[PDB]
Design brief:
This is part of a larger assembly, with chains A (about 50 residues) and B (about 55 residues).
Chain A lengths: L48
Chain B lengths: L2 H9 L1 H13 L32
Classes of the chains: A little secondary structure (about 50), B mainly alpha (about 55).
Organism (chain A): Rotavirus A
Protein name (chain A): Outer capsid protein VP5*
Subcellular location (chain A): Virion
């Protein structure tokens, strides 16, 4: 009952649309650092 | 004990042989391959500075 009809978008009036939540799945890769002194790395030693 | 003088004079040819030893061993290719140690290196990252997120409207 208004001027604005057939506009593409998503207003903030009722975004949930009766849903408890919107979900998304996927894979999540990470290459972050970490301290590992438990190695105490000088074993690759040459057995002789 | 005089025999040392005789041996030196007689064996002097080994001097030229030794000159050949060193002056062609230098010619031959050598490569002492200093390592990286057991502990491995790594740089931070390719990091570039920029202005952060702007709150436009």
């Amino acid at each position: 009952r208004t001027r604005t009809v057939n506009l593409y978008g998503l207003p903030a009036a009722n975004p949930n649309n009766g849903n408890e939540y919107y979900e998304i799945s996927g894979r999540f890769s990470l290459i972050s650092l970490v301290p590992t002194n438990d190695d105490y790395q000088t074993p690759i030693m040459n057995s002789v | 004990a005089s025999l040392i003088y005789r041996q030196l004079l007689t064996n002097s040819y080994s001097v030229d042989l030794y000159d050949e030893i060193e002056q062609i061993g230098s010619g031959k290719t050598q490569n002492v391959t200093i390592n990286p140690g057991p502990f491995a290196q790594t740089r931070y990252a390719p990091v570039n500075w920029d202005h952060g997120e702007i709150n436009d409207s």
